[PDB]
Amino acid sequence: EFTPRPYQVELLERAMKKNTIVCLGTGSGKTFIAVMLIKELAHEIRGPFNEGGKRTFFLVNTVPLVNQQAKVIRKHTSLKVGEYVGDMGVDSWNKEKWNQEFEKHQVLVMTAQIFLDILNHGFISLSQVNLLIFDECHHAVKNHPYRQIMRHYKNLEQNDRPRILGLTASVINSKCKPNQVEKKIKELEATLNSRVVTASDLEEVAVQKYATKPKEIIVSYNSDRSVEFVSPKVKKLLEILKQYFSNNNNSSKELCGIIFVERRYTAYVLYKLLNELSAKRDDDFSFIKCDFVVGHNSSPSSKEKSTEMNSKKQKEVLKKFRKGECNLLVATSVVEEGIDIPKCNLVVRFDLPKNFRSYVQSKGRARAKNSKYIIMVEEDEKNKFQEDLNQYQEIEKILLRLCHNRDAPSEEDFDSFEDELLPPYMPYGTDGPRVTMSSAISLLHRYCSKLPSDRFTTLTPKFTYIEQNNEEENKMFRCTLRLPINSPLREPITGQPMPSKKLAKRSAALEACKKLHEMGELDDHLLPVKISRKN
RNA sequence: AUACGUCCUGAUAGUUAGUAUCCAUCG
RNA sequence: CGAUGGAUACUAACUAUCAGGACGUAU
Ligand SMILES: Nc1ncnc2c1ncn2[C@@H]1O[C@H](COP(=O)(O)OP(=O)(O)O)[C@@H](O)[C@H]1O
């Protein structure tokens, strides 16, 4: 029942020296050793939470992946595991419930932002956290919540060891030139205080996992000039699916084809058209079934129509695909990574990739033999797309060339973090509710929304911007806060002048937390009057 | 005829700010 | 409603270089 991997046991013993990051292609099995390293330190986690024990947290950005990884860890381990997501509405939960939750479970898999929230209000500090692994660590750039969490390491002492981990295949998240990749990798390895390694030998990975991705049958059309009325791209899909049927006459019923899109409306219309064609019972199209996977809760009541509700729908649709009930798939932005099917040999790239990372991630989804990669390109843009593809190939070649070990001898880069020009409130020191400079906006989201209050758009009570000349004539901004009649007086009516508008708002709104803490609205854990709504 | 210097539309490559549009993820 | 990331476009400044337009110096 247990399925090992030869290179990964070597990877584990190499990584169990210091902080180490593994970078490999899709299908490598890098995620699998997460459970092995979790069980390697299971003894520490056994500590009771009477005075604060050791617990392991697994951060996953996407909501459909938390249950999948929870089932994966449950399959090989007997430890109690729960699932956490803001869909349940945990915004109105007091300290005692959280203490009960921590004492009950053993591993709490949860998205990043909820971890931001819990660390923001001091329900528990970074102390006594046994281990912590990111998801898609290549997102840790600029003001990503990953970096916001990592910033809390600066406030605490270095002697503490809340080990951090994060796994990614592509180390970029935007378009770039082959002369800035070294700068990007150096910056990323400096930010998270960890080295990056990659398997030197890629035997099986090149056999069927990564280096033998589906062959790119670049097919063009004339779309730049219901199937026959909309752009002929749908006709190209029909022709390529007829080619698929001609290839797989033996499997004339169905296969595991997956369609990637970038706009939800396109996916919805595409699924509707193919379901209509299949239900018609015509000779050309009679055995096609597709279902939704993407869209997410979006918003409870604010200008949306998808209404994907709870994760139960995603769980059941993925189960019905795994059992073969669902065989065609359309989605936009949740099945790029973390979706695994043991037998898949066809991926249709209906919409073009936008950067390097998307192209690498959405290409290795197929894992079976003779897999098919299909790209929709136009004739006029064919030259530009060909040169862009050559650039991507060169980027991959140089990236695998620089796969040599890169250490971090200069720890000064970690100290070189661009600290904000103003300090935030912190009434109880480093051991108390350390308010972050980036959580002032979260606090101001819901002015007096707690307790009986209007349901109108009180979130944005409007602010006045004032500009004046200065010594360098770059101008300074006077952000002013004028809240309506809903609460007692406020100290930060206007903030300190700032070079930028955003920093002006931050300086004019951060002192609200400091003022409100003294007057008694908040508490020891900065939870306002322990009631629903508001952070 | 060459070289150098001041300002600028054009070009090569990077940074910063504002603005406008679009997309995705999540609370 | 909000925090974000990405993409394009405009203005605008600095940064290392090329060219041309307005002027000056050495040969
Ligand atoms: N030995 C194995 N046992 C079970 N599943 C596997 C194995 N090897 C690969 N897989 C499947 O293939 C996928 C590859 O996962 P892994 O190599 O851990 O990282 P990634 O998912 O990033 O490629 C997994 O989602 C898993 O379901």
Give residue limits of the domains in chain A.
6-200, 204-401, 429-530
CA distances from A20 to A56, A198, A418, A519 (A): 18, 10, 24, 46
**Tokens 């109105």 identify what position?**
A92
Cα dihedral across residues A28, A32, A34, A37: positive or negative: negative
Query: Where are any strands of DSSP class E within A209-250?
Result: 215-221
Helix, coil or strand: residue A459: coil
Determination technique for this entry: cryo-EM
CA distances from A406 to A188, A298, A403, A463 (A): 12, 40, 8, 48
Which tokens go with A72? 């994966």
Query: Which protein residue has the closest C-alpha to ligand 1 atom 4?
Result: A3
Give the CA diameter of chain A: 78
A387: enclosing H helix or E strand: helix A382-401
Q: Which nucleotide is nearest to A475 (CA to C1')?
A: B17
Asked if A6-200 and A429-530 have one fold, the answer is no
Query: Which protein residue has the closest C-alpha to ligand 1 atom 3?
Result: A3
A331 C-alpha to ligand 1 centroid (Å): 21
User: What's CA A24's distance to the chain center, in Å?
Assistant: 18
Domain A429-530 has CATH 3.30.1070: no
Contact flag, residue A180 CB and nucleic strand B, below 7 A: yes
Report d(CA A210, CA A49) in Å as an integer: 43
Report d(CA A126, CA A120) in Å as an integer: 11
In eight-state DSSP terms, residue A429 is G
Show residues, CB within 7 A, near nucleic chain C: A 139, 141-145, 173-175, 299, 302-303, 354-355, 438, 441-442, 445, 457, 459-460, 502
Which tokens go with A18? 């210091």
Record the resolution, in angstroms: 3.4
* Residue A474: how many other CB atoms lie within 10 Å: 9
Q: Which long-range contacts (CB under 8 A, 24 or more apart) does A377-380 make?
A: A377/A218, A377/A219, A377/A220, A377/A221, A377/A352, A378/A220, A378/A221, A378/A222, A378/A223, A378/A224, A379/A220, A379/A221, A379/A222, A379/A224, A380/A224
Q: Rg of chain A over CA atoms, in angstroms?
A: 26
User: Which of A225, A288, A302, A294 has its CA nearest to residue A266?
Assistant: A294
Interior angle at CA A34, CA A30 and CA A40, nearest 5: 130
Contact in structure between A431 and A524 (CB atoms under 8 Å) = no
Interior angle at CA A307, CA A301 and CA A310, nearest 5: 100
Report d(CA A160, CA A139) in Å as an integer: 25
Superfamily per CATH, domain A204-401: P-loop containing nucleotide triphosphate hydrolases (3.40.50.300)
A495 C-alpha to ligand 1 centroid (Å): 52
Phi and psi, residue A62, nearest 5°: -90, 145
Cβ-count burial of A394 within 10 angstroms (0-12 exposed, 13-18 middle, 19+ buried)?
exposed
Query: Which protein residue has the closest C-alpha to ligand 1 atom 7?
Result: A29
Architecture of domain A6-200: 3-Layer(aba) Sandwich (3.40)
Look at phi and psi of residue A378 and say left if phi exceeds 0, alpha if psi is from -120 to 50, else beta: beta
Q: Which nucleotide is nearest to A142 (CA to C1')?
A: C5
User: What's CA A22's distance to the chain center, in Å?
Assistant: 18
User: Which of A410, A14, A360, A17 has its CA nearest to residue A186?
Assistant: A410
Distance A386 CA to C21 C1' (A): 39
User: What's CA A86's distance to the chain center, in Å?
Assistant: 15
User: Which of A113, A112, A119 has its CA nearest to residue A98?
Assistant: A119
